[PDB]
């Protein structure tokens, strides 16, 4: 099945998922000099005070921190978006070393990791319906650089030993995702896709300009996870990022001058 290795990696995905070569694929390189300030864009509205985290899952490609999305509790609104998008999960993409790991790049710069907070449009009623629509998802992307520790990340880092291998999960309640945000909510935005199979073209991407800083020790613990299941040959979960895809007929808009 699909993954990130030599034999089943991003360059192979098109054989099972032909949309891999589509017109609005993600991630992309963000050319900062070409991205145009759009004064009609709004400030993002990130309302996470009532977020209910439930569980953390190693799914064989990343780990997902899952939320209760049965009611409007944690929502993303404003910015480029019409209507209300409900938080369902967040996960990361990261590298084997600090010089790579992000999916989006900024003037070809790769960050050490990238956080994705995935939200679905509540006019479609459920997540499975939303991913079938061009405006079904809004993903908030946040770059990670290595420097000072992120205190709000450590609860995630410390549970990782209990979900080492694919299919393991652990209870993960009362985690506050506001602890993973940078100071500024300045962002770039463009229409795109899921960055993993099935690569559906259902995502409004909102990528924050300001990275968060995490410690070397924090990201090293991400790199001790396993793609494999329990007892199988150990394959470290590293370099679970899709490289930048052709921008094609798309404009990246900036929220800031
Ligand atoms: C039902 C088919 C849709 C699968 C997409 N699920 S997701 O939760 O939106 C998601 C988004 C992304 S991403 N990088 O935001 O496109 C990565 C993984 C997953 C996942 O399945 O865990
Ligand atoms: Zn992702």
Q: Which 3-state string (H, E, C) describes the chain?
A: CCCCCCCCCCCCHHHCCHHHHCCCCCCCEECCCCCEECCCCCCEEEECCCCCEEEEEECCCCEEEEECCCCCCCEEEECCCCCCEEEEEEEEEECCCCCCCCCCEECCECCCEEEEEEEEEHHHCCHHHHCCCCCCEEEEEEEEEECCCCHHHHHHHHHHHHHCCCCCEEECCCCCHHHHCCCCCCEEEEEECCCCCCCCCCEEEEEECCCEEECHHHHHHHCCCECCCCCCCCCECCCCCCCCCCCCCCCCEECCC
Whether 33 sits among the annotated catalytic residues: the reply is no
Backbone dihedral angles phi then psi of residue 145, each to the nearest 5 degrees: -115, 160
Q: Which domain holds residue 66?
A: 1-257
Give the C-alpha distances (Å, rounded to integers) separating 91 from 14, 18, 83: 23, 25, 23
HSE of 164 in the Cβ direction (CA atoms, 13 Å)? 10
* Contact yes or no for 56/63 (Cβ under 8 A): yes
- CB neighbours of residue 251 within 10 Å: 12
Q: Residue 200 sits in a domain of what CATH number?
A: 3.10.200.10
User: Which ligand 1 atom is the nearest neighbour of the CA of 200?
Assistant: 3
Structure token pair of residue 1: 């099945």
Resolution (A): 1.5
Overall domain count for the chain: 1
**CB within 6 Å of ligand 1 — which residues?**
59, 64, 89, 116, 118, 128, 131, 139, 194-196, 198
Dist CA 165 CA 227 (whole Å): 6
Residue tagged active-site, from 12, 61, 104, 119:
61
Determination approach: X-ray
Dist CA 48 CA 34 (whole Å): 32
Q: Which are the contacts of 216, defined by CB distance < 8 A and separation ≥ 6?
A: 98, 146
């Amino acid at each position: 099945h699909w993954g990130y290795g030599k034999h089943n990696g991003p360059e192979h995905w098109h054989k099972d998922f032909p949309i891999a070569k589509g017109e609005r694929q993600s991630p992309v390189d963000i050319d900062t000099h070409t991205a145009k300030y759009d004064p009609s864009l709004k400030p993002l509205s990130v309302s996470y005070d009532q977020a209910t985290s439930l569980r953390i899952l190693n799914n064989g490609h990343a780990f997902n921190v899952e939320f209760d999305d049965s009611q409007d509790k944690a929502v993303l609104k404003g910015g480029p978006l019409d209507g209300t998008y409900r938080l369902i999960q967040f996960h990361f993409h990261w590298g084997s070393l600090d010089g790579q790991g992000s999916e989006h790049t900024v003037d070809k710069k790769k960050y050490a990791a990238e956080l994705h907070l995935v939200h679905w449009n509540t006019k479609y009623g459920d997540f499975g319906k939303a991913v079938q629509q061009p405006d079904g998802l809004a993903v908030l992307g946040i770059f990670l650089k290595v420097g000072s520790a992120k205190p709000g990340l450590q609860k995630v880092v410390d549970v990782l030993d209990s979900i080492k291998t694919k299919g393991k999960s652990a209870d993960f309640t009362n985690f506050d995702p506001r602890g993973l945000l940078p100071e500024s909510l300045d962002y770039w935005t463009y229409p795109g896709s899921l960055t993993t199979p099935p690569l559906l073209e259902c995502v409004t991407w909102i990528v924050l300009k300001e990275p968060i800083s995490v410690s070397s020790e924090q990201v090293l613990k991400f790199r001790k996870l396993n793609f494999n299941g329990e007892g199988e040959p150990e394959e470290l979960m590293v370099d679970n990022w899709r490289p930048a895809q052709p921008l094609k007929n798309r404009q990246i808009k900036a929220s800031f001058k």
